[PDB]
């Protein structure tokens, strides 16, 4: 009745030995956590990263948020940290007529789900969300300014979210294109009820979230295997969310009661993330939540070797949806292959397998377009073109292995799945533009094998 909290997601308390290597640890808990989509990680009691900031010199531009269930919000779009904190505490204090920390978390949760489902209430809140910048930096130590001995100890921690993307078992650790959205941490300043709508990460990546300080962040998570179930429920109740969008900056997302999902047989788990704790989201695991009060979090995307095959599947799914890519998965694979001699050996082995599938798929595609009567061809360094100059006109995929052009429509490309979609000219007028021949690729494949042994 009213709100039934979902069951608790898994909570892990690794020893320092377990904890020291984030990638080994994540791989370890994966059979458990991937069944629940999210999990919480409590670091060893003495892992205590130093937090320090001047609340008067940190500025940011707030986003405003209406709180209505099923209402469309867009994924992306001046306070000091102090003036925001004052506004945030006053809001929670006045809303509940209580001291801001005496408000029970159970109560804030039940109240959140009441207020979002009521048309009459028009509660609006504000929050901060931006990548690390010079005007507002990471909450973790970074090199620059003389650091304290305590800060230096955490500079190279695997769990320092600045390091995670560039560590050795990370797969995005070598991507050329400056995907600032996916290897840089994001900073989040929350207040009571400010919420993150249901979503999955770009390219179905992992995310790792650290709550540096403040009141808890409440999470709901859904395991990856249930992603399409959830989408079907949402399509049915809010179809306006699923119309086509002109770019990445136009994704539509919404607040939705997890009990609604649970009624439709979608497994949902919850947690309250407190200061000093990590939440990890797994590939294609839907998640949402809201902040209990004034707080400060930091989060980053990442991709492990476990993720690589899912990344390929995600881009295929993006193609089916005519959804824009953040980067080319094939380009990332080939970039790594080209650096095989310095790859971690397990990484080399995993990349080799994805590359084999890529090559077999590419062979079949090239044979198909040849049979359609595309004969002329020319090598092309796709990686040099801005993304918006190499997207398939039909399905918006970022091209890299190959594409079709026609002199009839200068600058336009289709991927090889959409050869019929470029123009009315006969295919013999087309050119196949390709990055590699088979012969270019097999030394790269062999290098990976040698590195992998």
Ligand X SMILES: FC(F)(F)c1ccc(OC2CCNCC2)nc1
Q: Which residues bind Cl ion (CB under 5 A)?
A: 68, 121
Nearer of residues 100 and 255 to Mn ion, judged by Cβ:
255
Residue 121 touches which of Cl ion, Mn ion, Zn ion, none (CB < 5 to 8 A by kind)? Cl ion
Rounded least distance, CB 318 to ligand X, Å: 20
356 binds ligand X (CB under 6 A): no
Residue 262 CB: number of other CB atoms within 10 A?
A: 16
Q: Give the residues lining the site for Zn ion (CB under 5 A).
A: 392, 394-395, 406, 408, 415, 417-418, 423, 425
Q: Are strands 11-12 and 195-199 parallel, antiparallel or unpaired?
A: unpaired
Strand partners, 127: 63
Nearest to ligand X of 178, 367 (CB atom): 367
Is 437 among the residues that bind ligand X (CB under 6 A)?
yes
**C-alpha torsion 365→436→391→281, nearest 10:** 90
- Establish if 363 lies at the interface with ligand X (CB under 6 A): yes
Per partner kind, with CB cut-offs from 5 to 8 A, the member of ligand X, Zn ion, Mn ion, none near residue 392 is: Zn ion
Least spacing, CB of residue 288 vs Mn ion, in Å: 9
Nearer to ligand X, 228 or 367 (CB): 367
Select from Mn ion, Zn ion, ligand X, none the partner in contact with residue 425, using the beta carbon and a kind-dependent cut-off of 5 to 8 Å: Zn ion
Closest CB 356 distance from ligand X, rounded Å? 10
Nearer to ligand X, 256 or 359 (CB): 359
Nearest-CB residue to Zn ion? 408
330: which 2 tokens?
């094939």
Cα 397 to the chain's mean position, in Å? 18
Asked if residue 441 binds ligand X (CB under 6 A), the reply is: yes
Cβ proximity to Mn ion: between 170 and 207 the closer is: 207
Query: Residues annotated as binding site for 2-oxoglutarate?
Result: 127, 207, 209, 217
Binding positions for Mn ion, rule: CB under 5 A: 207
């Amino acid at each position: 009745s009213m709100f039934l909290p979902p069951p608790e997601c898994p909570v892990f308390e690794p020893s320092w030995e377990e904890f020291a290597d984030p990638f080994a640890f994540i791989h370890k808990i994966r059979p458990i956590a991937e069944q629940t989509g999210i999990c919480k990680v409590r670091p060893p009691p003495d892992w205590q990263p130093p937090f320090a900031c001047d609340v008067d010199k940190l500025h940011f531009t707030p986003r405003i948020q209406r709180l209505n269930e099923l209402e469309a919000q867009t994924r992306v779009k001046d306070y000091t940290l102090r003036t925001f904190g004052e506004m945030a505490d006053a809001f929670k204090s006045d809303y509940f007529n209580m001291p801001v920390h005496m408000v029970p978390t159970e109560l804030v949760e039940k109240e959140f789900w009441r207020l979002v489902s009521t048309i009459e209430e028009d509660v609006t809140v504000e929050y901060g969300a931006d990548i690390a910048s010079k005007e507002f930096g990471s909450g973790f130590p970074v090199r620059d300014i003389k650091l304290s001995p305590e800060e230096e100890e955490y500079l190279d921690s695997g769990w320092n979210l600045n390091n995670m993307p560039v560590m050795e078992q990370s797969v995005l650790a070598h991507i050329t294109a400056d995907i600032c959205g996916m290897k840089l941490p994001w900073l989040y300043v929350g207040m009571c009820f400010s919420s993150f709508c249901w979503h999955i990460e770009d390219h179905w990546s992992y995310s790792i979230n650290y709550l540096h300080w403040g009141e808890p962040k409440t999470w709901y998570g859904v395991p990856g295997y249930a992603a399409e179930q959830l989408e079907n429920v949402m399509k049915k109740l809010a179809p306006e969310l699923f119309v086509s969008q002109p770019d990445l900056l136009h994704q539509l997302v919404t607040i939705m009661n997890p009990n609604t999902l649970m009624t439709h047989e979608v497994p949902v788990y919850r947690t309250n993330q407190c200061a000093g704790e990590f939440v990890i989201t797994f590939p294609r695991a839907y998640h949402s939540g809201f902040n209990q009060g004034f707080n400060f979090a930091e989060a980053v995307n990442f991709c492990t070797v476990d993720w690589l095959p899912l990344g390929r599947q995600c881009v295929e799914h993006y193609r089916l949806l005519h959804r824009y890519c953040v980067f080319s998965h094939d380009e990332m694979i080939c970039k790594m292959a080209s650096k095989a001699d310095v790859l971690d050996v397990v990484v080399a082995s995993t990349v080799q397998k994805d590359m084999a599938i890529m090559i077999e798929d590419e062979k079949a595609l090239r044979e198909t377009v040849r049979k359609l009567g595309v004969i002329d061809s020319e090598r092309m360094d796709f990686e040099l073109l801005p993304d918006d100059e190499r997207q398939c006109v039909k399905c918006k995929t970022t091209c890299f292995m190959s594409a079709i052009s026609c002199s009839c429509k200068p600058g336009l490309l289709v991927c090889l799945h959409h050869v019929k979609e470029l123009c009315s000219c006969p295919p013999y007028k087309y050119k196949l533009r390709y990055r590699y021949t088979l012969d270019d690729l097999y030394p790269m494949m062999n290098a990976l094998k040698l590195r992998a042994e």
